[PDB]
């Protein structure tokens, strides 16, 4: 028998890379022009949100076999 939950981790690294890319894109967008000092902060908030969401997705997938 082979691992059925190993697959849960398949897209994990690329998903995290996508989210981090997104955050770095937003930080870049903030820096192109003068903006409110909190502009960069709001992209960070969206990143943290996506990571918690991806981790919860992973937990859900694991339970789905176990």
């Amino acid at each position, epitope marked *: 028998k082979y691992s059925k939950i190993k697959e849960c981790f398949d897209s994990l690294a690329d998903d995290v890379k996508s989210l981090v890319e997104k955050s770095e894109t937003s930080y870049e967008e903030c820096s*192109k022009d003068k*903006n409110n000092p909190h502009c960069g902060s709001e*992209g960070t908030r969206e990143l943290d949100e996506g990571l918690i969401e991806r981790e919860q997705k992973l937990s859900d997938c694991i339970v789905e076999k176990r």
Partner: antibody
Amino acid sequence: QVQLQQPGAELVRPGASVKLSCKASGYTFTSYWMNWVKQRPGQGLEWIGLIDPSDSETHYNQMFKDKATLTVDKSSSTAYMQLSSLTSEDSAVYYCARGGTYWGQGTTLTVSA
Amino acid sequence: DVVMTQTPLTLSVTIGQPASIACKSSQSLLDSDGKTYLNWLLQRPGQSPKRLIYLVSKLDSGVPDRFTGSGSGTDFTLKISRVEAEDLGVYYCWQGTHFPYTFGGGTKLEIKR
């Protein structure tokens, strides 16, 4: 898919006022300062002012101090610019631009009877 | 207000040839925050402006590396390594360091064929 949606045209009569809109989507509205730019037929670009959608703080080119008023509606992700006491000089294309990268298609304002 | 002065006013270039446009400001665009908000825009006729360069030398989204921005302080240059047919239109410098934001008068690029 950052998009800034402006109506193609507004026609209003001399003396009256107009309220131009710019509806944003594809990003977090409150994060970025929004510019407004005027361009007369065959001429260059003129900066009118900008607004911070998060707190409605504004910065104006003083040339437009008695002409333009900038506001936002966060419930609809819309930036507004109101132009008062219209004259033929106000006939122009008006752009909203989120920073310098993202531009609306412009509203052609015609001041005529 | 910061006066932005572009030279030349018009440029006629053979396809495949290089092109250079200069922008001079009446004051330094170096902000107390250490950044220099000099932008280059291109506007093809009947279209919204698009941004080619932000922060003096940084290529914006979609912009090919045929475009190079350089300079500092009060003197800036945009170079096209080799002009293509699609590059035609009006180029504007635009400073977003000092209020009010101000634009150069534009440099028209015509193609020779």
